[PDB]
Amino acid sequence: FRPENAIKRADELISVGEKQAALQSLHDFITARRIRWATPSTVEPVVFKFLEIGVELKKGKLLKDGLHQYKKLIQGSTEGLVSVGAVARKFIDLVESKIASEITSWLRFTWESYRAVLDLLRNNALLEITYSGVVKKTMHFCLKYQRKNEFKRLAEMLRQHLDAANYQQSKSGNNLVDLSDADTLQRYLDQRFQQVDVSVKLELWHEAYRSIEDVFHLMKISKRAPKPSTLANYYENLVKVFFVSGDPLLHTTAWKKFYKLYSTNPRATEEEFKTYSSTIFLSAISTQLDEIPSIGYDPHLRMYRLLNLDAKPTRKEMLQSIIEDESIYGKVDEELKELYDIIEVNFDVDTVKQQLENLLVKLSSKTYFSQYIAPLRDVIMRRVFVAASQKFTTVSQSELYKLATLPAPLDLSAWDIEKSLLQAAVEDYVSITIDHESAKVTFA
C-alpha cells in the first residue's frame, strides 16, 4: 500500500499501548515481498520509523531480522545499497543517542547493535565506507567503556570478515570487495592499526600481539603508504608491547622504526631527538647478553619477520647499527656514550664501581634511565661475574659478592648477588662450585 498509511497505523497502535504490535506492523511492511520493486527512497522512512520504535522497545532480534530481510529485498539497485547503508547509519545513530541519554543491558544492546550492523555491512564494495565508519565507532566504544571481552570478539569478527574477502577475491562477482584496490586497503589497514591501539590501551597484550600479525599482513598487500601520523603511533604502540613482552631487541627496533619516521616531522623539537636517541641506545646496552646460545625456547621467534626483519639480530649487531647510524648516535646523551665505553668497550672490574659511581649521579636525573635500571644492572653484573671468573680461582664469598655489588641504583643485597652468580652458572656464562662451608667460590 502506502508508507504514510503504514506510519499512521504505527502511531495509532502506540496510542493504544500496543507498542510491540506497532513495531511488528512496521516489520511486516518493510519485509514485504513487494519491497523488491519499490523505490528504496520512498520506503526508507518506514524503515527509519521501524528503527526508532525497535530501539525504544530494545527488540534487537527483530531489528536485525528487519534490516537483513529488507536488505535482501532492496540490494538489487545502487539506490538500494545506498538505502541499506543509510538505514545502517540511522540505526547506529539511534542507539548511540540512547547511550547518551542513559544501563548494563543498554551497553550490551549497543554492542549487539554495533555487532549486527558490522555483520550486515560485511564484504560489500558499496558499503565499505559505512562499515569502516562503524568499525571505528565500535572500537571507540570498547575503549570508552573498557569492554574488553566484547573487544576481543570484535577483533575476531574482523578477522573472519577479511578471511571471507580473501576467499571471494577469485570470484569476480559484482559488489565484492577488491583487496587489490588501495583505497579499500587504506581503510582495512586503518581499522587494524586502530585495533592495535585499543588493544594496547586496554592492556590486552595477547590480543595486541595477535593484531600485530593482522596489521603486518595488510601492510604487505598495501602498495600505498599509510599516514605518517598513524604509522608513528603504531610503532609507538609496538615499543609498549615489546617492553611488556620482554622482547628487548624488538623493543629497540620499534623505537628505531619510530625514530626514523619522526626525524621526518616538521614539528619535532631537538629536545625530543635528545631524549629519544638516548632511550634507543640505553635499551640496546640494557639488552640481555646473547653472547652464548640460549637454553633455549622462544615462542616469539616468528615476530622478527613481522617487524620486517629477515632474522633475529644480536645485541652487538643492534648496538652497532645504533652507533654507526649518525642520525641517532648524534643526538645521544654523552653519559650513555661513556657508559658504553665503561661496560662494552673497556670493561675493567677493578674500576667499574667507581666509573658507575661517578656516572650514575648524572644518569639518574635522566627521565628515560629510570625504567631500564633492572636489565642494565643484570647486564653489568653478568659482565662482572664473567670477568671475575677470569680473575680468580678460589675467591672468598665476601670478596666476590662485594666485588659484584654495584652502586645505587644498581645495588643488590648479598643474597640476591649469589642468586645472580648461580643464574650465570646455569646459563653457562661461567662454571662454578660454591662451598658454603668455607664461604668460598671456586671456578671449576
Side-chain angles (χ1 to χ4, degrees), residues 321-344:
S321 77
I322 295 175
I323 300 172
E324 173 201 353
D325 190 11
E326 292 310 311
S327 64
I328 300 177
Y329 201 75
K331 319 243 187 307
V332 172
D333 281 330
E334 296 301 327
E335 299 87 347
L336 264 49
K337 295 181 178 57
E338 187 172 7
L339 182 77
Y340 176 84
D341 175 66
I342 297 310
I343 306 182
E344 216 72 6

PDB file of all heavy atoms in Angstrom, residues 321-344:
ATOM      1  N   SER A 321      74.431  -1.080  14.938  1.00  0.00           N
ATOM      2  CA  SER A 321      73.536  -0.426  13.985  1.00  0.00           C
ATOM      3  C   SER A 321      72.999   0.873  14.575  1.00  0.00           C
ATOM      4  O   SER A 321      72.414   1.694  13.869  1.00  0.00           O
ATOM      5  CB  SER A 321      72.364  -1.331  13.598  1.00  0.00           C
ATOM      6  OG  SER A 321      71.383  -1.368  14.621  1.00  0.00           O
ATOM      7  N   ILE A 322      73.181   1.051  15.878  1.00  0.00           N
ATOM      8  CA  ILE A 322      72.797   2.309  16.505  1.00  0.00           C
ATOM      9  C   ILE A 322      73.994   3.261  16.575  1.00  0.00           C
ATOM     10  O   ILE A 322      73.844   4.465  16.357  1.00  0.00           O
ATOM     11  CB  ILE A 322      72.235   2.078  17.922  1.00  0.00           C
ATOM     12  CG1 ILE A 322      70.930   1.289  17.851  1.00  0.00           C
ATOM     13  CG2 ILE A 322      71.973   3.394  18.623  1.00  0.00           C
ATOM     14  CD1 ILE A 322      70.377   0.915  19.200  1.00  0.00           C
ATOM     15  N   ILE A 323      75.182   2.726  16.851  1.00  0.00           N
ATOM     16  CA  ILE A 323      76.377   3.570  16.940  1.00  0.00           C
ATOM     17  C   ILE A 323      76.787   4.130  15.580  1.00  0.00           C
ATOM     18  O   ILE A 323      77.230   5.276  15.469  1.00  0.00           O
ATOM     19  CB  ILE A 323      77.567   2.810  17.548  1.00  0.00           C
ATOM     20  CG1 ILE A 323      77.227   2.340  18.957  1.00  0.00           C
ATOM     21  CG2 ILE A 323      78.796   3.700  17.627  1.00  0.00           C
ATOM     22  CD1 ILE A 323      78.264   1.436  19.538  1.00  0.00           C
ATOM     23  N   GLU A 324      76.597   3.321  14.546  1.00  0.00           N
ATOM     24  CA  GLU A 324      77.007   3.678  13.199  1.00  0.00           C
ATOM     25  C   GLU A 324      76.046   4.674  12.552  1.00  0.00           C
ATOM     26  O   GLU A 324      76.459   5.527  11.764  1.00  0.00           O
ATOM     27  CB  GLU A 324      77.121   2.411  12.349  1.00  0.00           C
ATOM     28  CG  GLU A 324      77.389   2.651  10.876  1.00  0.00           C
ATOM     29  CD  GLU A 324      77.002   1.462  10.011  1.00  0.00           C
ATOM     30  OE1 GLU A 324      76.650   0.403  10.577  1.00  0.00           O
ATOM     31  OE2 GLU A 324      77.045   1.590   8.767  1.00  0.00           O
ATOM     32  N   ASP A 325      74.771   4.592  12.915  1.00  0.00           N
ATOM     33  CA  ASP A 325      73.761   5.479  12.347  1.00  0.00           C
ATOM     34  C   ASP A 325      73.816   6.857  13.002  1.00  0.00           C
ATOM     35  O   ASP A 325      73.260   7.068  14.081  1.00  0.00           O
ATOM     36  CB  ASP A 325      72.366   4.872  12.497  1.00  0.00           C
ATOM     37  CG  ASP A 325      71.313   5.632  11.712  1.00  0.00           C
ATOM     38  OD1 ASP A 325      71.690   6.491  10.887  1.00  0.00           O
ATOM     39  OD2 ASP A 325      70.108   5.369  11.911  1.00  0.00           O
ATOM     40  N   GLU A 326      74.498   7.788  12.338  1.00  0.00           N
ATOM     41  CA  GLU A 326      74.718   9.133  12.872  1.00  0.00           C
ATOM     42  C   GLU A 326      73.450   9.911  13.209  1.00  0.00           C
ATOM     43  O   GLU A 326      73.464  10.760  14.102  1.00  0.00           O
ATOM     44  CB  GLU A 326      75.608   9.953  11.934  1.00  0.00           C
ATOM     45  CG  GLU A 326      77.032   9.447  11.861  1.00  0.00           C
ATOM     46  CD  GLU A 326      77.631   9.235  13.237  1.00  0.00           C
ATOM     47  OE1 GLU A 326      77.523  10.148  14.088  1.00  0.00           O
ATOM     48  OE2 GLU A 326      78.198   8.147  13.473  1.00  0.00           O
ATOM     49  N   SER A 327      72.362   9.622  12.502  1.00  0.00           N
ATOM     50  CA  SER A 327      71.095  10.299  12.755  1.00  0.00           C
ATOM     51  C   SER A 327      70.624  10.031  14.178  1.00  0.00           C
ATOM     52  O   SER A 327      69.957  10.867  14.787  1.00  0.00           O
ATOM     53  CB  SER A 327      70.026   9.847  11.762  1.00  0.00           C
ATOM     54  OG  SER A 327      69.742   8.469  11.921  1.00  0.00           O
ATOM     55  N   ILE A 328      70.991   8.866  14.708  1.00  0.00           N
ATOM     56  CA  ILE A 328      70.640   8.505  16.075  1.00  0.00           C
ATOM     57  C   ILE A 328      71.782   8.797  17.032  1.00  0.00           C
ATOM     58  O   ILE A 328      71.605   9.526  18.008  1.00  0.00           O
ATOM     59  CB  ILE A 328      70.309   7.011  16.210  1.00  0.00           C
ATOM     60  CG1 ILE A 328      69.125   6.633  15.326  1.00  0.00           C
ATOM     61  CG2 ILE A 328      69.988   6.675  17.651  1.00  0.00           C
ATOM     62  CD1 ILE A 328      68.805   5.157  15.359  1.00  0.00           C
ATOM     63  N   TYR A 329      72.952   8.227  16.748  1.00  0.00           N
ATOM     64  CA  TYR A 329      74.091   8.335  17.656  1.00  0.00           C
ATOM     65  C   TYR A 329      74.493   9.787  17.898  1.00  0.00           C
ATOM     66  O   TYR A 329      75.044  10.119  18.949  1.00  0.00           O
ATOM     67  CB  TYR A 329      75.282   7.502  17.169  1.00  0.00           C
ATOM     68  CG  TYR A 329      76.259   7.164  18.276  1.00  0.00           C
ATOM     69  CD1 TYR A 329      75.959   6.190  19.220  1.00  0.00           C
ATOM     70  CD2 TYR A 329      77.480   7.815  18.375  1.00  0.00           C
ATOM     71  CE1 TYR A 329      76.847   5.877  20.236  1.00  0.00           C
ATOM     72  CE2 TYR A 329      78.377   7.507  19.387  1.00  0.00           C
ATOM     73  CZ  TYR A 329      78.055   6.537  20.314  1.00  0.00           C
ATOM     74  OH  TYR A 329      78.943   6.231  21.322  1.00  0.00           O
ATOM     75  N   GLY A 330      74.210  10.645  16.923  1.00  0.00           N
ATOM     76  CA  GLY A 330      74.497  12.062  17.040  1.00  0.00           C
ATOM     77  C   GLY A 330      73.793  12.759  18.192  1.00  0.00           C
ATOM     78  O   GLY A 330      74.399  13.570  18.889  1.00  0.00           O
ATOM     79  N   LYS A 331      72.519  12.443  18.398  1.00  0.00           N
ATOM     80  CA  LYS A 331      71.706  13.157  19.385  1.00  0.00           C
ATOM     81  C   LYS A 331      71.590  12.405  20.722  1.00  0.00           C
ATOM     82  O   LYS A 331      70.739  12.723  21.557  1.00  0.00           O
ATOM     83  CB  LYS A 331      70.316  13.437  18.807  1.00  0.00           C
ATOM     84  CG  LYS A 331      70.330  13.878  17.345  1.00  0.00           C
ATOM     85  CD  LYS A 331      69.786  15.291  17.182  1.00  0.00           C
ATOM     86  CE  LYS A 331      69.646  15.669  15.714  1.00  0.00           C
ATOM     87  NZ  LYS A 331      70.913  15.462  14.963  1.00  0.00           N
ATOM     88  N   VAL A 332      72.464  11.420  20.907  1.00  0.00           N
ATOM     89  CA  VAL A 332      72.518  10.607  22.119  1.00  0.00           C
ATOM     90  C   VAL A 332      73.286  11.317  23.228  1.00  0.00           C
ATOM     91  O   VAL A 332      74.382  11.823  22.990  1.00  0.00           O
ATOM     92  CB  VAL A 332      73.215   9.260  21.836  1.00  0.00           C
ATOM     93  CG1 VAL A 332      73.462   8.499  23.122  1.00  0.00           C
ATOM     94  CG2 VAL A 332      72.392   8.429  20.874  1.00  0.00           C
ATOM     95  N   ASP A 333      72.714  11.353  24.432  1.00  0.00           N
ATOM     96  CA  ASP A 333      73.392  11.917  25.606  1.00  0.00           C
ATOM     97  C   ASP A 333      74.799  11.349  25.807  1.00  0.00           C
ATOM     98  O   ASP A 333      75.053  10.176  25.534  1.00  0.00           O
ATOM     99  CB  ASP A 333      72.560  11.703  26.876  1.00  0.00           C
ATOM    100  CG  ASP A 333      71.424  12.700  27.004  1.00  0.00           C
ATOM    101  OD1 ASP A 333      71.573  13.831  26.502  1.00  0.00           O
ATOM    102  OD2 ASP A 333      70.387  12.362  27.619  1.00  0.00           O
ATOM    103  N   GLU A 334      75.717  12.199  26.254  1.00  0.00           N
ATOM    104  CA  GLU A 334      77.113  11.805  26.425  1.00  0.00           C
ATOM    105  C   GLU A 334      77.288  10.726  27.491  1.00  0.00           C
ATOM    106  O   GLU A 334      78.104   9.811  27.326  1.00  0.00           O
ATOM    107  CB  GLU A 334      77.989  13.023  26.736  1.00  0.00           C
ATOM    108  CG  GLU A 334      78.035  14.047  25.608  1.00  0.00           C
ATOM    109  CD  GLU A 334      78.558  13.466  24.296  1.00  0.00           C
ATOM    110  OE1 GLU A 334      79.421  12.561  24.339  1.00  0.00           O
ATOM    111  OE2 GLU A 334      78.104  13.916  23.218  1.00  0.00           O
ATOM    112  N   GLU A 335      76.534  10.849  28.584  1.00  0.00           N
ATOM    113  CA  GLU A 335      76.616   9.905  29.698  1.00  0.00           C
ATOM    114  C   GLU A 335      76.464   8.462  29.230  1.00  0.00           C
ATOM    115  O   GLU A 335      77.136   7.564  29.730  1.00  0.00           O
ATOM    116  CB  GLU A 335      75.549  10.203  30.758  1.00  0.00           C
ATOM    117  CG  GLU A 335      75.629  11.573  31.417  1.00  0.00           C
ATOM    118  CD  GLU A 335      74.882  12.645  30.648  1.00  0.00           C
ATOM    119  OE1 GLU A 335      74.513  12.399  29.479  1.00  0.00           O
ATOM    120  OE2 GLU A 335      74.651  13.732  31.220  1.00  0.00           O
ATOM    121  N   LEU A 336      75.579   8.255  28.261  1.00  0.00           N
ATOM    122  CA  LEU A 336      75.348   6.935  27.686  1.00  0.00           C
ATOM    123  C   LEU A 336      76.532   6.447  26.872  1.00  0.00           C
ATOM    124  O   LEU A 336      76.818   5.253  26.848  1.00  0.00           O
ATOM    125  CB  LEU A 336      74.098   6.943  26.812  1.00  0.00           C
ATOM    126  CG  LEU A 336      72.805   6.479  27.474  1.00  0.00           C
ATOM    127  CD1 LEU A 336      72.596   7.169  28.795  1.00  0.00           C
ATOM    128  CD2 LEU A 336      71.659   6.777  26.550  1.00  0.00           C
ATOM    129  N   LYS A 337      77.212   7.366  26.193  1.00  0.00           N
ATOM    130  CA  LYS A 337      78.393   7.011  25.419  1.00  0.00           C
ATOM    131  C   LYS A 337      79.515   6.593  26.365  1.00  0.00           C
ATOM    132  O   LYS A 337      80.242   5.619  26.114  1.00  0.00           O
ATOM    133  CB  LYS A 337      78.838   8.183  24.541  1.00  0.00           C
ATOM    134  CG  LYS A 337      77.844   8.584  23.453  1.00  0.00           C
ATOM    135  CD  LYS A 337      78.379   9.750  22.622  1.00  0.00           C
ATOM    136  CE  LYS A 337      77.426  10.134  21.499  1.00  0.00           C
ATOM    137  NZ  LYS A 337      76.068  10.475  22.007  1.00  0.00           N
ATOM    138  N   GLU A 338      79.636   7.324  27.467  1.00  0.00           N
ATOM    139  CA  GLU A 338      80.628   6.996  28.477  1.00  0.00           C
ATOM    140  C   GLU A 338      80.307   5.631  29.074  1.00  0.00           C
ATOM    141  O   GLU A 338      81.182   4.776  29.199  1.00  0.00           O
ATOM    142  CB  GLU A 338      80.688   8.079  29.556  1.00  0.00           C
ATOM    143  CG  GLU A 338      81.814   7.894  30.560  1.00  0.00           C
ATOM    144  CD  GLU A 338      81.958   9.077  31.496  1.00  0.00           C
ATOM    145  OE1 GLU A 338      81.105   9.990  31.448  1.00  0.00           O
ATOM    146  OE2 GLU A 338      82.936   9.100  32.273  1.00  0.00           O
ATOM    147  N   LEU A 339      79.037   5.431  29.419  1.00  0.00           N
ATOM    148  CA  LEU A 339      78.544   4.156  29.927  1.00  0.00           C
ATOM    149  C   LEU A 339      78.937   3.023  29.001  1.00  0.00           C
ATOM    150  O   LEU A 339      79.447   1.987  29.439  1.00  0.00           O
ATOM    151  CB  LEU A 339      77.021   4.190  30.015  1.00  0.00           C
ATOM    152  CG  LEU A 339      76.377   2.925  30.576  1.00  0.00           C
ATOM    153  CD1 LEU A 339      76.548   2.894  32.086  1.00  0.00           C
ATOM    154  CD2 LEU A 339      74.914   2.824  30.178  1.00  0.00           C
ATOM    155  N   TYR A 340      78.700   3.245  27.711  1.00  0.00           N
ATOM    156  CA  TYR A 340      79.025   2.277  26.677  1.00  0.00           C
ATOM    157  C   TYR A 340      80.509   1.969  26.686  1.00  0.00           C
ATOM    158  O   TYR A 340      80.903   0.819  26.493  1.00  0.00           O
ATOM    159  CB  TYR A 340      78.606   2.776  25.292  1.00  0.00           C
ATOM    160  CG  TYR A 340      79.019   1.843  24.176  1.00  0.00           C
ATOM    161  CD1 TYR A 340      78.236   0.750  23.839  1.00  0.00           C
ATOM    162  CD2 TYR A 340      80.197   2.043  23.466  1.00  0.00           C
ATOM    163  CE1 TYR A 340      78.609  -0.113  22.825  1.00  0.00           C
ATOM    164  CE2 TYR A 340      80.575   1.183  22.448  1.00  0.00           C
ATOM    165  CZ  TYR A 340      79.781   0.106  22.138  1.00  0.00           C
ATOM    166  OH  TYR A 340      80.149  -0.748  21.126  1.00  0.00           O
ATOM    167  N   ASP A 341      81.336   2.989  26.896  1.00  0.00           N
ATOM    168  CA  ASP A 341      82.770   2.736  26.974  1.00  0.00           C
ATOM    169  C   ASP A 341      83.092   1.844  28.171  1.00  0.00           C
ATOM    170  O   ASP A 341      83.794   0.827  28.035  1.00  0.00           O
ATOM    171  CB  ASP A 341      83.559   4.046  27.056  1.00  0.00           C
ATOM    172  CG  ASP A 341      85.049   3.818  27.267  1.00  0.00           C
ATOM    173  OD1 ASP A 341      85.706   3.272  26.354  1.00  0.00           O
ATOM    174  OD2 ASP A 341      85.557   4.175  28.352  1.00  0.00           O
ATOM    175  N   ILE A 342      82.498   2.202  29.311  1.00  0.00           N
ATOM    176  CA  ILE A 342      82.757   1.583  30.612  1.00  0.00           C
ATOM    177  C   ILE A 342      82.341   0.116  30.706  1.00  0.00           C
ATOM    178  O   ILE A 342      82.981  -0.685  31.395  1.00  0.00           O
ATOM    179  CB  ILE A 342      82.023   2.367  31.714  1.00  0.00           C
ATOM    180  CG1 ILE A 342      82.557   3.796  31.790  1.00  0.00           C
ATOM    181  CG2 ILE A 342      82.178   1.693  33.052  1.00  0.00           C
ATOM    182  CD1 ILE A 342      84.068   3.884  31.874  1.00  0.00           C
ATOM    183  N   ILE A 343      81.284  -0.243  29.990  1.00  0.00           N
ATOM    184  CA  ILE A 343      80.715  -1.577  30.107  1.00  0.00           C
ATOM    185  C   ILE A 343      81.023  -2.426  28.879  1.00  0.00           C
ATOM    186  O   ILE A 343      81.364  -3.605  28.992  1.00  0.00           O
ATOM    187  CB  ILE A 343      79.204  -1.501  30.283  1.00  0.00           C
ATOM    188  CG1 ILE A 343      78.859  -0.583  31.451  1.00  0.00           C
ATOM    189  CG2 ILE A 343      78.610  -2.895  30.443  1.00  0.00           C
ATOM    190  CD1 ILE A 343      77.389  -0.497  31.703  1.00  0.00           C
ATOM    191  N   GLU A 344      80.889  -1.821  27.704  1.00  0.00           N
ATOM    192  CA  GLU A 344      81.055  -2.554  26.456  1.00  0.00           C
ATOM    193  C   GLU A 344      82.452  -2.441  25.833  1.00  0.00           C
ATOM    194  O   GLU A 344      82.940  -3.410  25.250  1.00  0.00           O
ATOM    195  CB  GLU A 344      79.980  -2.137  25.450  1.00  0.00           C
ATOM    196  CG  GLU A 344      79.478  -3.267  24.563  1.00  0.00           C
ATOM    197  CD  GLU A 344      78.608  -4.280  25.303  1.00  0.00           C
ATOM    198  OE1 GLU A 344      78.285  -4.062  26.492  1.00  0.00           O
ATOM    199  OE2 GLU A 344      78.242  -5.301  24.685  1.00  0.00           O
TER     200      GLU A 344
END
